From a paper:
The β‐barrel assembly machinery (BAM complex) is essential for outer membrane protein (OMP) folding in Gram‐negative bacteria, and represents a promising antimicrobial target. BAM is thought to exist in two major conformations, defined by closing (lateral‐closed) or opening (lateral‐open) of a membrane‐facing gate in the core component BamA, itself an OMP. Transitioning between lateral open and closed states is proposed to be essential for BAM function, with multiple antimicrobials shown to bias the conformational equilibrium in vitro. In X‐ray and cryoEM structures, opening of BAM's lateral‐gate leads to an outward swinging motion of the six N‐terminal β‐strands of the barrel relative to the ten C‐terminal strands and their connecting loops.
As no structure of DAR‐B bound to the complete BAM complex has been reported, we also solved cryoEM structures of wild‐type BAM (BAM‐WT) in n‐dodecyl‐β‐D‐maltoside (DDM) micelles in the presence or absence of DAR‐B, reaching resolutions of 3.3 Å (+DAR‐B) and 3.5 Å (−DAR‐B). In the absence of DAR‐B, our new apo‐BAM‐WT structure, which is currently the highest resolution structure of this complex, is in the lateral‐open conformation, consistent with previous cryoEM structures in detergent and nanodiscs. By contrast with the lateral closed state of BAM/BamA in which eL3, which contains L501, is highly resolved and tucked towards the barrel in all structures (named here “eL3‐in”), eL3 is dynamically disordered in BAM lateral open states, adopting different conformations in different structures (“eL‐in” and “eL‐out”). In some structures, including the structure of BAM solved here, eL3 is not visible in the electron density. This is consistent with a conformational malleability of eL3, which has been shown previously using molecular dynamics simulations, where a disulphide lock designed to trap the eL3‐out conformation also enabled eL3‐in conformations. The PELDOR distance distribution obtained for the apo‐BAM in the OM is more consistent with a lateral‐open‐eL3‐in conformation (although given some persistent longer distances involved, we cannot discount the presence of a population of eL3‐out conformations). Instead, the shorter PELDOR distance distribution components observed, match well with lateral open‐eL3‐in conformations, such as that seen in BAM‐LL (a conformationally constrained BAM which contains a disulphide bond between BamA E435C S665C), and BAM stalled in the act of folding BamA. While the L501R1‐S755R1 distance distribution of apo‐BAM suggests populations of both the lateral‐closed and lateral‐open (“eL3‐in”) species in the OM, it is also broader than the in silico predicted distribution for these states. Hence, the conformational heterogeneity of BAM in cells may not be entirely represented by existing atomic models (although more distance measurements with other spin pairs will be needed to confirm this).
Residue numbers in the entry:
A (entry chain D): 26 to 243
B (entry chain C): 25 to 89
C (entry chain A): 92 to 433, 437 to 496, 503 to 806
D (entry chain B): 26 to 391
E (entry chain E): 24 to 110
Write the structure that this text describes.
């Protein structure tokens, strides 16, 4: 696939192909360069280029593995913020789907695993490197992601209201009030807690939630 | 792979996240203590630099080879 | 200073990656420096690895080729000698059993019959431990409480070609199980536990039964919430009289409560699509039965390849747990397109269970030619209410033209509610309208038209008949399968029917009954026996006759493999009639205008108003597929039979022709079928031969279906 | 599918010597493909043989025709017999012929009748040949247990234990007796000595040398019969060293880097052995320095050698008998005594030479 | 109107006539938790109170709910007991 050559020619070819937008061939060249010469100067730049190419080529698992390698090999490096941002962005991009995106399906109530991972990674980025140029986009993504995780919680609470499971509803809304206090889903889920408290004849406890609802109404 | 205008740099995945509504805190009425402060899903207040959405440069930084 | 490349040659039974893994354990890999003095060390290291395979005579050579820039290329050559062979397995000290039958259960083999591959005369130290355990279980569950293995030896021939295995044992003596003393902190439930531990006086000791008694006590406690109990048996053997008394300690822990039940891997399936199948729910005392029932229901759903459960304990809480279900999404639905034989001609169709993860079941198909047009829609909501009441509908528009024309369109609605964990009922309403014009006369159809009051001429093709019907649809279903795509145990039953309510032009009633029963043989459920049948019956109410366009057909790839689709059953009988439309060449000789004075037999299938089909099918693993994806392919040998008869055919008048009212004319076939779950949905290939066949039936041995 | 690597070719040579065959008496089924030590035994003017089954026969040494026959098989069904798995070498003494078994049994049949004088059980497979000298019978079993039996009763008198490694060669070294002491070799590579009266140890020593990192790399056991002359004991191991040890102390005199499972001969100042590579060499008793080496029968799987009319005799898996002469180390002649081959040592005494084939037939060669 | 199938919906903390009698005023939170177990439901809006609710909805038969609420002071000492039988 790749002819044997000194590292400089291989890296030149890889850069030329990245600039032309040929992700697959650039990935092949960079992987060959990395395997053949893991000790040379190019050991870092090829890692970064591989991360970028993997992410653009939609080979997200490989991008995640490469980021994991890089974070362990050079836990202190001037461009770590870039790698942390790319980890968060990879986890975010691993969430969306195309078809039900086109048909306008609300994907909030599907698996939130990747959303939580991306939130963790972006939070690490923003708390660690507030001066980096990626902090603003990280904050916007976090503000959206917190409300993509409160919506899932509300979606579970709605079902356990339908099936008439009241303790589950109360606990779920309590968890929402403790974790995602300021989101809109917490304001929508609050009247579900009052109904649950009143279905179990604990009215003296439902009045407190009624007070909270009244004090924050539009 | 593809042929599009400036698809080398910009993010993949549109810009839906820029339309998310801002967050606002709940008010605790008189004579009660809300539990809200107990979470770890905190978003720090930061005035950090940066662009947003498609205006960001994802191209990897250039090591001083 | 560096190895530029590494190559392996001669290895046959060992994947090169395994050798590389062994090589890197010695500190050699691409990019590492190499020392020529250590070449022998690498060779010896690789040599020692093959002892795991039993090829004790193997040898390995390492070749180093210089490369520019002081790089080197390393090439490894392997001489994989023949593996050692088990010459004998000897058991010394056994007096109660024949050494032949003790070995018969061993995983290892000293002899392999020619007529079947019961195993291989190869040696693997991993299997020896399991074989020793099997021997212990065989000896220890026959009452030999004192059985123990003194020592074992594995030996090697001086030519390194043969293996000898010896096992020393001490039998002791048989013992009687005098009684069981279950005691401890039972937390009540003494009634159930005392019954689980029932023994008969003089019953022989049995270790496997003791293990089963412990597992059953664990399961009983786990049913009430104590899902972390402590159960321990401590037999007290008495060699003085050779009685053994089985003391069992039971200590139920704390009743556990479910804090959360979480689903993982449902990347596309909506969350509530999984929760509405659960029987264990948050904030309630735990029950293992319900947690397993949730798995069973999710499996029966059919949307997921694999469903797994977990009950991780909550850290820092003595009496709470979380329940995690990990699912692997399956590519539900089907697609199938095509083009006509011979201008524009094309067919289409899409079916989707779990449409976009919403749980709906949607299906669309149609076709457009010069001859005909056809279209259909179907939408079903499995949970129209929380309990499981479903609501669905259907539309279709059919327009066929030769001349002989048939326009038909209708509607349908059905509301089905459960009656039990496995049973279900249904009800609905339907509407159908049929416009028939210029049908060429024939007995089977003119009889029906006469029953309806129509009196068309028998010698012309210019008569028309139009009708309109309202029906009441009912049904019932029993479902206890293991899975929804490739089941391996359990049965299914599905009764369906309909009847015309007053005011419909034609009066009749119709019934069908599909069945399926899987009986596993192997413990892993790889070898399964499938029993399958279909039935049907219909007739007119009052003086009305059942319409010919609702008849039963059989023959395709769905009912009895081997025969051309819808070719079984009665064949039409044409009256001598004029060519009112046209008389084409090389066609239309059946009772045509020219000649053909009397009634003419034919081979045009018309179906009948009663059916009976059956099938016996044997399922085996696919010979050349790894277990990694052996659950997307199934191979099968089958024996199918079916018949169709017209209960109203009158042989007294049409005596010169076959008696279609005779059920005895059974068809049959046999062959082999292969089934693969392609991205386009299931694909079925089958080769069969109709070794029982009657005049007029059309054979089709190779059949491919979506 | 893949074949063996090495096998030298039958070396052409003229038959300057004039040997011939005889007998070809079929004892029975034979050992077949199994590895065992069922060599014949000769005493007076009669021979005895076994058949890897209950079959035992005593043949006249002048004609090869039987004088009495016996079967030691045991019933296990209406028309079925459980094989005796007879695998011990035949040895003889006054009125008794002693045999071993892999069924843990040991037999002692009357010389004149073949009727069982006595029969007893031992500590596992009695693979080694029984040996008797001025006292009790001695047997070496697969469990590493060395047991002594009363020659007239079969009752165990005393037992000695030796270590057993994970993987070892299929076989057990016969004991050798000298001055009331018995010297044997174990599967661990040690050479041990004991007293006959109660099995008390006298000395122990190591001769194995591989010390590998894995079982077969460590596969080094003293499977040969140790030999004693003039107060010195020689020992050999599969991958170890040919050595000479002082009988009184067990300290080693000299080593030689040779390893094989076949026993070796001793005569004068000359010792002859067969290597694990099937090479034939002669060495000095002084220090083992080589006299001459014959190295053309590579990987033919020869049998143990014997000394007959000054000429070494050996078999192979192809049924040939090779005659070697001390005058030059050259081959004097060759025959094809049997079709199936030989996997059992030949025997010779009183000018008579004989050997048992792998198929059960017994041949006499002169 | 008519309805024909619904599962058994068990919710809450499993109380019994034995354990409910063990608890008495003056017990610390540790002892109450040991006796009755960890409560599935507590008061979040600033107050020490444990709700032991025992719901059972056996199909179409009906519904039963024992409600046992315990109020502790700031130091975790049980000051008041109030158990309310079925609805």
């Amino acid at each position: 696939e790749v002819p044997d050559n000194p590292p400089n020619e291989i890296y030149a070819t890889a850069q030329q192909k990245l600039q032309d937008g040929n992700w697959r061939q650039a990935i092949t060249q960079l992987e060959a360069l990395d395997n053949r010469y893991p000790f040379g100067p190019y050991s870092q730049q090829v890692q970064l280029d591989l991360i970028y190419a993997y992410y653009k080529n939609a080979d997200l698992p490989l991008a995640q593995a490469a980021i994991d390698r890089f974070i362990r090999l050079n836990p202190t490096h001037p461009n770590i913020d870039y790698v942390m941002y790319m980890r968060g962005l990879t986890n975010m991009a691993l969430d969306d789907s195309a078809l039900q995106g086109f048909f306008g399906v609300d994907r909030s109530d599907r698996d939130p695993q990747h959303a939580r991972a991306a939130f963790s990674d972006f939070s690490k980025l923003v708390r660690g490197y507030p001066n980096s140029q990626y902090t603003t986009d990280a904050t916007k993504r976090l503000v959206f992601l917190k409300d993509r995780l409160a919506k899932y919680e509300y979606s579970v609470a709605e079902y356990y209201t339908e099936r008439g499971a009241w303790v589950a509803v109360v606990n779920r809304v309590e968890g929402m009030l403790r974790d995602y206090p300021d989101t809109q889903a917490t304001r929508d889920a609050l009247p579900l807690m009052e109904n649950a408290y009143r279905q179990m004849q604990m009215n003296a406890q439902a009045e407190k939630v009624a007070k909270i609802i009244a004090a924050n109404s539009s | 792979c593809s042929s599009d205008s400036r698809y080398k740099r910009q993010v993949s995945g549109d810009e839906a996240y820029l339309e998310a509504a801002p967050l606002a805190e709940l008010h605790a009425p008189a004579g009660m203590i809300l539990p809200v402060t107990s979470g770890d899903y905190a978003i720090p207040v930061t005035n950090g630099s940066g662009a947003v959405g498609k205006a960001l440069d994802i191209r990897p930084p250039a090591q001083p080879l | 200073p560096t190895i530029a490349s590494i190559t392996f040659s001669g290895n046959k039974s060992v994947k090169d990656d395994m050798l590389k893994q062994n090589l890197e354990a010695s500190g050699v890999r691409v990019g590492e420096s190499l020392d020529r003095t250590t070449i022998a060390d690498i060779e010896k290291g690789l040599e020692d690895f093959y002892y795991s395979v039993g090829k004790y005579s193997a040898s390995v050579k390492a070749v180093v080729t210089p490369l520019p820039r002081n790089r080197v290329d390393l090439k490894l050559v392997f001489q994989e000698g023949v593996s050692a062979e088990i010459q004998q397995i000897n058991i010394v000290g056994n007096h109660a059993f024949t050494t032949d039958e003790l070995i018969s259960h061993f995983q290892l083999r000293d002899e392999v019959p020619w007529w079947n591959v019961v195993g291989d005369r190869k040696y693997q130290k991993q299997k020896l431990a399991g074989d020793l355990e099997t021997l212990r279980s065989y000896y220890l569950d026959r009452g030999y409480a004192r059985f123990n293995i003194d020592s074992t030896q594995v030996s090697l021939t001086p030519d390194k070609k043969g293996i000898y295995v010896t096992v020393n044992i001490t039998e002791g003596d048989q013992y009687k199980l005098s009684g069981v003393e279950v005691s401890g902190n039972l937390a009540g439930h003494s009634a159930e536990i005392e019954q689980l531990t029932k023994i008969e006086p003089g019953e022989l000791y049995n270790g496997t039964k003791v293990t089963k008694m412990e597992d059953d006590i664990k399961k009983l406690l786990g049913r009430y919430g104590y899902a972390y109990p402590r159960v321990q048996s401590m037999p007290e053997i008495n060699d003085a009289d050779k009685t053994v008394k089985l003391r069992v300690n039971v200590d139920a822990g704390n009743r556990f409560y479910v804090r959360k039940i979480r689903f993982e891997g449902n990347d596309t399936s909506k969350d509530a699509v999984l929760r509405r199948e659960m029987r264990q729910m948050e904030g309630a005392w735990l029950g293992s039965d319900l947690v397993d029932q949730g798995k069973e229901r999710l499996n029966r759903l059919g949307f997921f390849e694999t469903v797994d459960t977990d009950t991780q304990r909550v850290p820092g809480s003595p009496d709470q747990v979380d329940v995690v279900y990990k699912v692997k999404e399956r590519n539900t639905g089907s697609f199938n397109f095509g083009i006509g034989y011979g201008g524009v001609s094309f067919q289409a169709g899409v079916q989707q269970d779990n449409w976009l993860g919403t749980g709906y079941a949607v299906g669309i198909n149609g076709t457009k030619n010069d001859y005909q047009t056809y279209a259909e829609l179907s939408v079903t909501n499995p949970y129209f209410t929380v309990d499981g009441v479903s609501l669905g509908g259907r539309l279709f528009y059919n327009d066929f033209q030769a001349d002989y024309t048939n326009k038909s369109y209708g509607t349908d609605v059905t509301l089905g509610f459960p009656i039990n964990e496995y049973n279900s009922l249904r009800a609905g309403l339907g509407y159908v309208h049929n416009s028939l014009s210029n049908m060429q006369p024939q007995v089977a159809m003119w009889r029906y038209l006469y029953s309806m009051g129509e009196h068309p001429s028998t010698s012309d093709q210019d008569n028309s008949f139009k009708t309109d019907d309202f029906t009441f649809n009912y049904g019932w279903t029993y479902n206890k399968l293991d899975r929804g795509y490739f089941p391996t145990d359990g049965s299914r039953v599905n009764l369906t029917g309909k009847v015309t309510i007053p005011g419909s032009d034609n009066e009749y009633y119709k019934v069908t009954l599909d069945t399926a029963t899987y009986v596993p043989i192997d413990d892993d459920h790889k070898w399964v026996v499938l029993g399958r049948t279909r039935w049907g019956y219909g007739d007119g109410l009052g003086g009305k006759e059942m319409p010919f366009y609702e008849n039963f057909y059989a023959g395709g790839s769905s009912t009895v493999r081997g025969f051309q689709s819808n070719t079984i059953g009665p064949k039409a009988v044409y009256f001598p009639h004029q060519a009112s439309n046209y008389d084409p060449d090389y066609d239309y000789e059946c009772a045509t205008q020219d000649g053909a004075k009397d009634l003419c037999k034919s081979d045009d299938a018309v179906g009948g108003n009663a059916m009976a089909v059956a099938s016996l099918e044997f399922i085996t693993p696919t010979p050349f597929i790894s277990d990694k994806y052996a659950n997307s392919v199934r191979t099968s040998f089958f024996w199918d039979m079916g018949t169709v008869w017209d209960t109203n055919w009158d042989s007294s008048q049409y005596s010169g022709y076959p008696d279609y009212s005779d059920p005895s004319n059974i068809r049959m076939s046999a062959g082999i079928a292969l089934q693969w779950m392609s991205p386009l949905g299931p694909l079925v290939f089958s080769y069969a031969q109709p070794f029982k066949k009657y005049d007029g039936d059309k054979a089709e041995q190779f059949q491919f279906n979506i | 599918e893949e074949d063996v690597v090495k096998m030298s070719p039958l070396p052409t040579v003229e038959n300057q010597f004039t040997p011939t065959t005889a007998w070809s008496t079929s004892v029975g089924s034979g050992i077949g493909n199994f590895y065992s030590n069922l060599h014949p035994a000769l005493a007076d003017n009669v021979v005895y043989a076994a058949d890897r089954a209950g079959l035992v026969k005593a043949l006249n040494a002048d004609d090869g025709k039987e004088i009495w026959s016996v079967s030691l098989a045991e019933k296990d069904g209406w028309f079925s017999k459980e094989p005796a798995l007879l695998s011990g070498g035949v040895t003889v003494s006054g009125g008794h012929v002693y045999i071993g078994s892999e069924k843990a049994q040991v037999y002692a049949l009357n010389t004149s009748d073949g009727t069982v004088a006595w029969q007893t059980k031992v500590a596992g497979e009695a693979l080694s040949r029984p040996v008797v000298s001025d006292g009790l019978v001695l047997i070496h079993t697969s469990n590493g247990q060395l047991q002594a039996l009363n020659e007239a009763d079969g009752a165990v008198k005393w037992t000695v234990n030796l270590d057993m490694p994970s993987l070892s060669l299929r076989g057990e070294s016969a004991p050798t007796t000298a001055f009331g002491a018995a010297v044997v070799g174990g599967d661990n590579g040690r050479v041990s000595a004991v007293l006959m009266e109660q099995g008390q140890m006298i000395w122990q020593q190591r001769i194995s040398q591989a010390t590998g990192s894995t079982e077969i790399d460590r596969l080094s056991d003293v499977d040969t019969t140790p030999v004693v002359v003039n107060g010195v004991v020689f020992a050999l191991a599969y991958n170890g060293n040919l050595t000479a040890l002082d009988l009184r102390s067990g300290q080693i005199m000299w080593k030689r880097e040779l390893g094989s499972v076949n026993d070796f001969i001793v005569d004068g100042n000359r010792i002859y052995l067969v290597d694990q590579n099937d090479r034939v060499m002669a060495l000095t008793i002084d220090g083992g320095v080589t006299l001459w080496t014959q190295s053309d029968l590579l990987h033919r799987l020869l049998t143990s050698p014997v000394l007959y009319n000054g000429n070494l005799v050996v078999g192979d898996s192809e049924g040939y008998l090779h005659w070697i002469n001390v005058e030059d180390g050259r081959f004097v002649a060759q025959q094809k005594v049997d079709s199936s081959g030989f996997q059992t040592e030949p025997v010779a005494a009183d000018g008579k030479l004989l050997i048992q084939a792998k198929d059960g037939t017994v041949y006499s060669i002169t | 109107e008519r309805v024909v199938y619904r599962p058994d919906i068990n919710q809450g903390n499993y109380l019994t006539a034995n354990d409910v009698s063990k608890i008495r005023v003056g017990m610390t939170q540790q002892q109450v938790a040991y006796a009755l177990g960890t409560p599935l439901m507590s008061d979040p809006f600033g107050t020490n109170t444990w709700f032991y609710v025992f719901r059972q909805q056996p199909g179409h038969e009906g519904v039963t709910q024992q409600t046992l609420t315990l109020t502790f002071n700031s130091s975790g000492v049980l000051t008041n007991i109030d158990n309310k039988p079925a609805l």
